Every structure is written in structure tokens, then in C-alpha cells.
Design a protein around this nucleic acid. Sequence first.
DNA 1: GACCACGGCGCA
DNA 2: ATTGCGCCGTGGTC
Length: 539
Amino acid sequence: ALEEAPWPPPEGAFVGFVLSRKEPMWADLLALAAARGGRVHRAPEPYKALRDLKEERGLLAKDLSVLALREGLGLPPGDDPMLLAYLLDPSNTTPEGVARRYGGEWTEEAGERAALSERLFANLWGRLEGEERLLWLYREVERPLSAVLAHMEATGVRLDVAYLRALSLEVAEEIARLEAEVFRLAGHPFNLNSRDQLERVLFDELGLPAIGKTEKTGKRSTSAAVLEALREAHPIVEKILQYRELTKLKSTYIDPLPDLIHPRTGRLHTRFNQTATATGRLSSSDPNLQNIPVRTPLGQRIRRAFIAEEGWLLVALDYSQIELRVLAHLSGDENLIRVFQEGRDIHTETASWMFGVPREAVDPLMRRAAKTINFGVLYGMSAHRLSQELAIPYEEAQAFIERYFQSFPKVRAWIEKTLEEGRRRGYVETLFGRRRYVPDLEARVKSVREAAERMAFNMPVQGTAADLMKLAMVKLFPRLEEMGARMLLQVHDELVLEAPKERAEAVARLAKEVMEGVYPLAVPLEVEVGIGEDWLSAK
DNA sequence: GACCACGGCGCA
DNA sequence: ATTGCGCCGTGGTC
Ligand SMILES: Nc1ncnc2c1ncn2[C@H]1CC[C@@H](COP(=O)(O)OP(=O)(O)OP(=O)(O)O)O1
Ligand SMILES: [Mg+2]
Ligand SMILES: [Mg+2]
């Protein structure tokens, strides 16, 4: 059923390629082929072959396109069945699975990936027949978004390697200073990075009362949370909390990053995974630049490492109280939509309450803490964990939650209806109609069911802010090109741009606008914007 | 080496 | 009884 023709593929053919590794920016293009009609074309020289394609359409289009950009080609990504499958069911996140479920086998031969892409696209496109809302998301958001992501990936972001190189030697000494103490207090050395070894030390050798257990193996958890509950029980606990901090940071960022610099660009090249989340958010892989530190002083010193190119400036844009604004529009709650019409800030209001200080006294590090409290509580946190969390009585934590939802009467109502129809329909969806199947909404085990429910009503809110960000990226990108500006990073509701100093102002102004007016809601969408030579100074 | 489950923990 | 992610060592394979 499949014939073979000489390389030169007819326009609009489905590409198939094989990389030496999963990272497009570092991969060697080992094989390139294409499938169209009922024939398949294998390119004798892939790199040379790339020059002929006009569009990379097929399985993992964005990745091949990223490699193209890296090589000097402007080959934009087109149709990609993965995107179609991701829209039908966000649990379709890998080609292997998409293939086994929709019509084939993900192999290692380019010709086969080409044939596979064609038929997968044929089958998946049919399944979308009549899914107007999903087709809208595909052609108006995803497909075009993939191209934006390609440019972002190949563009990359600059890092101060010398800065981290030296920061490492410094932290190396503090870590040593902390472990050396931990051992003194324990009366003997042991692998502090070993959770099992530390467990025995705290709970058996010393007599510290265990607080909780681990999920799959029932060990006495040694969590930061457990450790904070014991901070005053013994001097060793605080030291271990600082060791945990430094080592987490040093081995996850300070050391790995400097070695991820690409030779040809001198920049860090993250990957932006478009079909990896159940709610519609993107994920940042290999270099994951979506979880760069920002909470602690050492975290900030690390964020300061992300810098603009000489003669440029980074522009950081971030939606204010994003998911709360989305919630007001989804729930349609009176008091909540008014909160925003009145210019209030829930995070600041909660922070004022938490630290018993006047609103105008809340610093950013207090407001942050407030955020995990508001979203934690909104999405289901228990009084128990709340009380433990804020270190307050169980009652006052129970009161905080009582008023919180009582203040926004429509929220709980919306949640219920979201859950009701999630039960009957078997899935919940976003404003734009992004679907997430939550079968466990009818599990007979309370534990499982309620866990399903929390996953279910969070999806429309989280997923709607995602559609929103993606849409804004699709609208903003072209404007930046014509303006000679770059879109470097996306952090769920934030965007990091790099604009020429002469234009930094004008770019910030334009982006903030595109973002706030992306899709008008029952509430305005505010965007805090910052400009500076490093990511930290921007935000 | 390469990979995996876990417990942990960085961010949104 | 927060949700959604990806990456790091440790232990234990293969
Ligand atoms: N801990 C959490 N749990 C659940 N959802 C959370 C969350 N933290 C954030 N989100 C979701 C909801 C918000 C969204 C983006 O995170 P930002 O930190 O930006 O919080 P934003 O509310 O937008 O306020 P801004 O500080 O920027 O003014 O991710
Ligand atoms: Mg925000
Ligand atoms: Mg943010």
C-alpha cells in the first residue's frame, strides 16, 4: 500500500525525521523523509533535504522546525497530529501513545514516521469533524502557537556563566559549613542527601517525633514541611533546612545551567512542550526554565543570571491575579468581578491578614506567601493543612476558608455545576472549550473521587488562563517581529521578551496591551510589566 | 552507562 | 483534602 519515490516530495507532504537525541537544538538530523499520496520520499542527505521543505507538517513538527531555524532555515511548523490528539484528549502527550491509539506504531525509521504522520493526521482530523470549538483552538491557537514556540526555542536566552561558575564555589563552602554542623549535632557523618539515612537519624538516633509518612512506601517523611514542624525540637533541623535549600539550588541550577550553553549561540535553549499537560499549559523540558528560582535570596541571585544581549533589555510581562480573574468570569460571581472592577488585589488582602500588617505594608515576599494560600484554599486545601501551614489553630484556618468562599458565593456554585456536568459528560472544559477527561468523577472510593473532583474543577480555571496566554502569544508574536523584538520565555502567565534598548519601552507598551486585550472578559485583565538587564530586574 | 520509582522541591 | 509541571540524588536494577 506504500510505494517509494526519489526524495523530491510534492508540496504539502507529511515529514518524518530521526534525531540523535530529543533536544532539537542539540540533535543530529540522522534521517528525513516525507509521505504524500500513497508514496514516501526518503531524502539521501537530510540537512541538504531540509532546504527543500516549505513547511514542516507532521508528528513533532515544531521540533524539526526548531532544528531548521538553528541551521539557518525559516521552515515554519504546520499541521501536527499530536496537536489534534492533544485537543481531543490532553492525555495524548507522546507520539508512541498517539500512534498506538490512532493508527500505527512510532518506530525509528523516518519513512515510517512520514507515513505515520500522514495517516495519523487523516484519522485524527476526521475525529475532529464537527468539533468546532476544538478546531477553533487548533487553527487559531495551537497550530500557529507551535511556530511561535519554534522561534522561542531556537532564539534561546542569554546566561551569565561566569556569574554562576563563581556563585557555585561560594555556595559550595556554605553547604560544607552546614553539613559539617549537621554531622556534629548527629554525632557522626552520613549521606545527608539520603532521605533514608536522615530518617533514621532524626527519628531513631535522636528522639524527634515523626510528623507524617511518605505516600508509596510509608516511610517517616523528612519533608521541609515535616522539618519545619520540628525546627524548634532540635538544633539540627534548621541546619538541614538550609542544606536542603542550597543543595537543591546548586545541583538544579547553579551547576547544570552553565553546561547547557549552546556553542553556536552562547545561549540557553529550553524546549517548550505543547502536548504535555492535562489542563492545556505548556511545560518546559530539558532546560526547564519555568521553575527558575525567585523566592529566596539565593534564588534571586540565580535569577539575576538570566540577562539580555549587549544593547538589549529583557521585558517581563505577567498577568495580575490571573486565575482569580478567570474564576470571576467562569463563575460569574458578583462580589468577585467587582473586586477587580474596584482595583483590589486578593493576594495583598490575604497577606495583610496573614502577617497582621496594613495592606500598604505587604512586601512581595509576603504577597507571594499569600498566593499559595488563596489558590491552595480555592482549589481544595483542608483546614488541617491550612492551620498547620499558617501555623494557626485549626479553627481560625477553618474560619478563613469559611469566609473566603462565603465572600464569593458564586464560586462554590460554579464548582458544583462544573462537577455535575463533568460527571454526566465525563469531562470538563475551558472557556474556549479545551477538554480534560476525568472519569474518576464517579469512582466509588471517596478518596479517589474527591481527588478527581479537585483535578476537575481546577482544569477550566487553570486551562482558561492557559488558552488566554497562548492566544496572546499568537497575537503578540508577529507584532514583535516587525518591531525587531524577541519572545524568549513563557511561564504560564508570564512572558519574557528581549527588545533592543532603543525599543524596549515601545515593546513593553505594545505587549502589555496585546496581553490585557487578548480576549475581553467580565473582568479586565491587568498585566504588570517590567524592563531591566536581567530577569530579576524586569519582574 | 542508561533507566526507574520515590521522596523532595524548584516554579506557575 | 490545593492544582499543574520537570529535575535531582538515592537505591536498586540491567
Ligand atoms: N500554588 C499555586 N497553586 C495553584 N495554582 C497556582 C499556584 N500559584 C499560582 N497558581 C496559578 C494561578 C495563577 C497562575 C500564575 O501564577 P502567579 O504566581 O503569577 O500568580 P498570579 O495569581 O497570576 O499573580 P501575580 O503574582 O503574577 O500578580 O498559576
Ligand atoms: Mg501572574
Ligand atoms: Mg507569573
